[PDB]
Amino acid sequence: AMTPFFWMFEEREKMFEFYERVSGARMHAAYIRPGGVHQDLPLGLLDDIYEFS
């Protein structure tokens, strides 16, 4: 098919932006630790997640 690959990898890039904003790493984030999470979310992250979703 090969067209939806690009169509949806654009959205994948947006979710990678979310990952990077929350952790600084796009893929190998290491955000979730065995006591919780590493850091609190950026002040503007939730609004952008809502806009994407």
């Binding site: 609190d40 979310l41 950026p42 002040l43 503007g44 992250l45 939730l46 609004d47 809502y50 979703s53």
Partner: protein, 71 residues
């Protein structure tokens, strides 16, 4: 002095988020499509009938000219 300030949803929450499947029907019955196909076929047949009869007459005219020129 200052108060707690962190990422929180705005008061009243967020707006509803669409998630259901949305594949609307364009809309045309099979009878209508078949009728359109048969109608355009018939129109083409009629036009071809007239044009090919005219072509037969033109070919007969050309053959007549050749017959006149033959001797």
């Amino acid at each position: 002095a200052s108060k707690v300030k962190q990422d929180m949803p705005p008061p009243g929450g967020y707006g509803p988020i669409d998630y259901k499947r949305n594949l609307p029907r364009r809309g045309l019955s099979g009878y209508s499509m078949f009728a359109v196909g048969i109608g355009t076929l018939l129109f083409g047949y009629w036009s071809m009938m007239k044009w090919n009869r005219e072509r037969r007459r033109l070919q007969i005219e050309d053959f007549e000219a050749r017959i006149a020129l033959m001797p």
